[PDB]
Amino acid sequence: YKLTYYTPEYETKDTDILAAFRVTPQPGVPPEEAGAAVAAESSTGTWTTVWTDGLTSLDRYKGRCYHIEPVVGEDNQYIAYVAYPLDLFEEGSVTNMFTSIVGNVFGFKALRALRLEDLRIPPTYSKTFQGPPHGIQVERDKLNKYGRPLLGCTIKPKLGLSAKNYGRACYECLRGGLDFTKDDENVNSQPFMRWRDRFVFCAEAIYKSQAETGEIKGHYLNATAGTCEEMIKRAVFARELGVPIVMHDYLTGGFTANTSLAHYCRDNGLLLHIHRAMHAVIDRQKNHGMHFRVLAKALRMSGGDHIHAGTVVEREMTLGFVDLLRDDFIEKDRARGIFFTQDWVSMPGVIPVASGGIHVWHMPALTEIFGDDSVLQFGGGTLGHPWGNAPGAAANRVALEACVQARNEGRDLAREGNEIIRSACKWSPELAAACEIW
Amino acid sequence: KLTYYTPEYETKDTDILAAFRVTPQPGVPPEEAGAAVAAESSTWTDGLTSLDRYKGRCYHIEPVVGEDNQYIAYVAYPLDLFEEGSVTNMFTSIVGNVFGFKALRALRLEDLRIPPTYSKTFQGPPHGIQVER
Amino acid sequence: YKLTYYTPEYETKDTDILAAFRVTPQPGVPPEEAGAAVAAESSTGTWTTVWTDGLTSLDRYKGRCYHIEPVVGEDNQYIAYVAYPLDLFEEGSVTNMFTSIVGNVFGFKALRALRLEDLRIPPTYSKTFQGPPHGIQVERDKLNKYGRPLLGCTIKPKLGLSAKNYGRACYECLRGGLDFTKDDENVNSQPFMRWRDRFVFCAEAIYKSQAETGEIKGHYLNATAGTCEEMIKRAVFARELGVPIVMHDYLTGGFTANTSLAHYCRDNGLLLHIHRAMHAVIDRQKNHGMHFRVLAKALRMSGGDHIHAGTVVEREMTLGFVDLLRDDFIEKDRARGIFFTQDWVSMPGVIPVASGGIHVWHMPALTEIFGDDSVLQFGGGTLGHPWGNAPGAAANRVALEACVQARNEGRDLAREGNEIIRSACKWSPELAAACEIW
Amino acid sequence: MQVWPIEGIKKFETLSYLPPLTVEDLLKQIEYLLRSKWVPCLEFSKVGFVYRENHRSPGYYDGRYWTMWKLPMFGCTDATQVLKELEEAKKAYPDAFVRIIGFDNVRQVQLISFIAYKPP
Amino acid sequence: MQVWPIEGIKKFETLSYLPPLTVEDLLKQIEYLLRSKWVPCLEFSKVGFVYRENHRSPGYYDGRYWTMWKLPMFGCTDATQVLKELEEAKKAYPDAFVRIIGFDNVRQVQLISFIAYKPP
């Protein structure tokens, strides 16, 4: 009923897991019934009475809709706030958190559409999670890299390259100034290139580029696989090769597998780059699904050192979950999609990874928008350079460092960006060539 | 009094709290003895971090009625000082050093407020009363 | 009764474990009854008769109080001597020795206070223990260090440093002349610094300092953990890194875990630095508890290569258990707290570790009091040097070696100490700077 | 079309792909640390780059640590006094690389490192 | 404020942070061994310090052993005769480090080692 599950005078406990749903009720369903239904069908709802309820105190196990209000978003949409008791969730299990909250309610007939927008993860629950294998600061210390965004490149063509030609592209990108190169999310082990061959040639490229430049280099070696045994086998060989970073598609691989890999990476000193493949199946539409900030919080709990975070070329929403991924304490700010004040009680942060159509002219905006604690990934922005991968990497490293220098001097990146880039073009023929084509 | 006697500090829900029965040496005021219990059980390299984030602080001192020169010192330890799931480290952190401090003639740890945030990192009893029955 | 357990004409056997208790009886309890009660309630005492005693010969399993005498210590205190049969104790188990002797008797109502002062560990029992993984002489040979006290520094701030900044302090201390740096006893694995990150950066500091100076360097990497599995995992990674020494808080970790770690260290060539965290909970008060010399004997049996032994800035008591920790044969000497002649039948000795407010001016007294077979730990005595950690280490190494030289020449350290230090200040600007502030 | 050099342009992380900074540019980078309430510190080494001599496990490298020049300059308000220690370092070790690093007591970490002198 | 050197002051364990000993200071250290009934012995090497070439397991280092100059000087009563072998060693191997070590038959161990000559 309503007053069992719609409890608008409920005061949330500091141990509650809070959820903010964007609910679109069916026509004729009043908001208080939709709100009670979201809480009931995501906890203790039953269509008929059962005698076993007399063996316990169910009110201690129900979810409660303690607030619902219309949103200015589209037809007949509301935000329903739900509180879930701490005892419902298995410790250290993102899998059980998702199952418990989003496992059933999205299919209820009286709800025409439903989207989970945010979760308040209390310290009593988040402390049962390891979190990132290392996190932002440990990664900077391990790589000896400070004071600028990190730089990466996605190797293309995505599929069709031999393992050796893959590693050849990686070496040329790394030697030009990029910190990382990247296995495509689709690149696991395939007839055109088997994973162990790729790991071998990519390791040779990492170490050749590192010896030539004197800076620590990496390549996200994708350990995503069809079974947890294959996944760990690929991480084990990366450990043997002694490389700094591996990679996992956490949504398609799954949280149970991802949490196991994060535990391995912590146990063996490997950084974990996380790709969000298939996220748009879930997080694209405003009316139904789960916003990416929910999937971003879940990755930080399950474990990852990087996570892909999209582009800026909507910005304030992106800045919202960047803060949720990086910071220790994030104040409530619904204008940026932050529906709950989030305290991570010293769980390490995740480096967001910007990627999508980014080239050299975007470097001022990216450095200003994300700050130093990010990775800027280039696709054709490096490989499409007319002089090749190493000059393309040099153009991106030069463009970035000219932005960092100007920002450090107190200059305004959002307004002086084009002139900062043009000025750097004067002493970098590599950067000039990139700016002539883009 | 020192940077370790903070009599109006509001405990956090994540703090581990301790109640010490402190017997100061002759000529040691209870305020000074209480600050020493917080300091000796917690805290150029200091400029590379924030010490106030990692100090234990004595936030309350009261006398023991019926015993002369006995006081209860309440100390708050931040959650970040303790390894998850390790009673060994909780004992090491809180009782590892302070009982030997010369300014304290005697010291007895009477109680510990184990915050739910810390206790949830422990398995606890293999079964417990109700499972066993 | 008295004559079952107070047996003043008993002649102790060479297989007996002997105990010396400082007993404070309740008012009205005569000393012979207190003595019988200490023996009875630490062996075969029963409040009612049981028929099962007829199935054995209990006199062969009882403890015997064979002597009791008043002590000049405080009100109504006595020393009760108890003999325990060898068959009572599990071989190789300090845990069972403590359980058997101190497990129950301290709570007996008729005893207002009780303190175990000393134990006579017979060769027939001590030979069932491995003892120190290496011991004083093996350690000197492994490190190629002879003829002077070893030098260490406790890294501060105790908590709050990142793993890399921790290792940076370690490198600067080691490169200046110290043999060791030290994980704090509280430093295990915490949100501010996870243990594997610390081991990595501390290993880099060890090897950078060793390559720069040409002397073997170490850092006590703390393996203390919440479970024996975590403890061994940390020792295993130190073994992989190939470093010389790890560390354990033997009292808070416990003797069962410590004996397992000592066995691992012997099996893998690791030195074991032992911290005595929480000892003052037990050994501070004269009237109740267990004196540190008991806990020191137990550590030597369970296993450790160093043990923290306090300061001298009471000395004769400290010198007593230093001898009990280091020597093969220690004659009875109650003025120094040695209640029993102790024969270790070639079980290796433990290097005592002096620590607490020690700075350069104390180097003559420390070298004279402890001799060469010690470790001198500095806190602010190194890190508080106005020129930094490396000049602070240099000041301590210079001060120590000037003391060793003067002592080797036959000079009197207890009387000429200040002039030996002042004379060394003349050619060591590093030492001069330390002596200007302290 | 130019070929990116394979020798003579070994790097020192942030700002080492820029041309050598002027003394005014260098002071501006120092003032950035001071305005940010970060503590500057100098580091020096005769070996410029990372290597893997003692171990090759993930995340282990040698040569990340350099040697501290004196102490971090807590309470510094004069960017030129950092420049003054840089010239002191270069006069004592003309054959050493010198980089300027920065510590934050708030983030509790090192967060800055850029090259300030290379030997000829 | 002085910066502790990074080169030119490599060390040889006990007494190597002192200034170079005079011949009288050196004899006093030798007399300490004799008065202690310890047997002096000379050791020499053209490689001064430890390294890890054959293994890197805990407690394994190369370069701890040097080469024995002749034999331990059992029954020595004249500290100058140790000095006489030191000069012999330096004349035969001017390019070798020479250290003086000591053995005790009672502790059954080596318990002394200090540098006595470095090549220029």
Swiss-Prot record, chains A, C:
**UniProt-recorded Gene Ontology molecular function terms:** magnesium ion binding; monooxygenase activity; ribulose-bisphosphate carboxylase activity
Coiled coil (UniProt feature) = none
> What biological-process terms (Gene Ontology) are attached?
photorespiration; reductive pentose-phosphate cycle
Q: Which reaction is the catalytic activity of this chain? A: 2 (2R)-3-phosphoglycerate + 2 H(+) = D-ribulose 1,5-bisphosphate + CO2 + H2O; D-ribulose 1,5-bisphosphate + O2 = 2-phosphoglycolate + (2R)-3-phosphoglycerate + 2 H(+)
Name any cofactors this protein relies on. Answer: Mg(2+)
Quaternary arrangement and interactors, per the entry?
Heterohexadecamer of 8 large chains and 8 small chains; disulfide-linked. The disulfide link is formed within the large subunit homodimers.
Entry protein name: Ribulose bisphosphate carboxylase large chain
What organism is recorded for this protein?
Oryza sativa
- Gene name per UniProt: rbcL
UniProtKB/Swiss-Prot annotation, chains D, E:
Q: Mind telling me which residue stretches traverse the membrane in this protein?
A: none
- Predominant cellular place of this UniProt entry's protein: plastid
Name any Gene Ontology BP term.
photorespiration
Q: Which UniProt keywords apply?
A: Calvin cycle, Carbon dioxide fixation, Chloroplast, Photorespiration, Photosynthesis, Plastid, Transit peptide
Q: Does the keyword Zinc apply?
A: no
Please give the function described in this protein's UniProt entry.
RuBisCO catalyzes two reactions: the carboxylation of D-ribulose 1,5-bisphosphate, the primary event in carbon dioxide fixation, as well as the oxidative fragmentation of the pentose substrate. Both reactions occur simultaneously and in competition at the same active site. Although the small subunit is not catalytic it is essential for maximal activity.
Q: What is the name of this protein?
A: Ribulose bisphosphate carboxylase small subunit, chloroplastic 1
Subcellular locations according to the entry: Plastid, Chloroplast
Subunit-level organization: Heterohexadecamer of 8 large and 8 small subunits.
Q: Which domain of life is it from?
A: Eukaryota
The UniProt family comment states: Belongs to the RuBisCO small chain family.
Q: Which GO terms describe its cellular component?
A: chloroplast
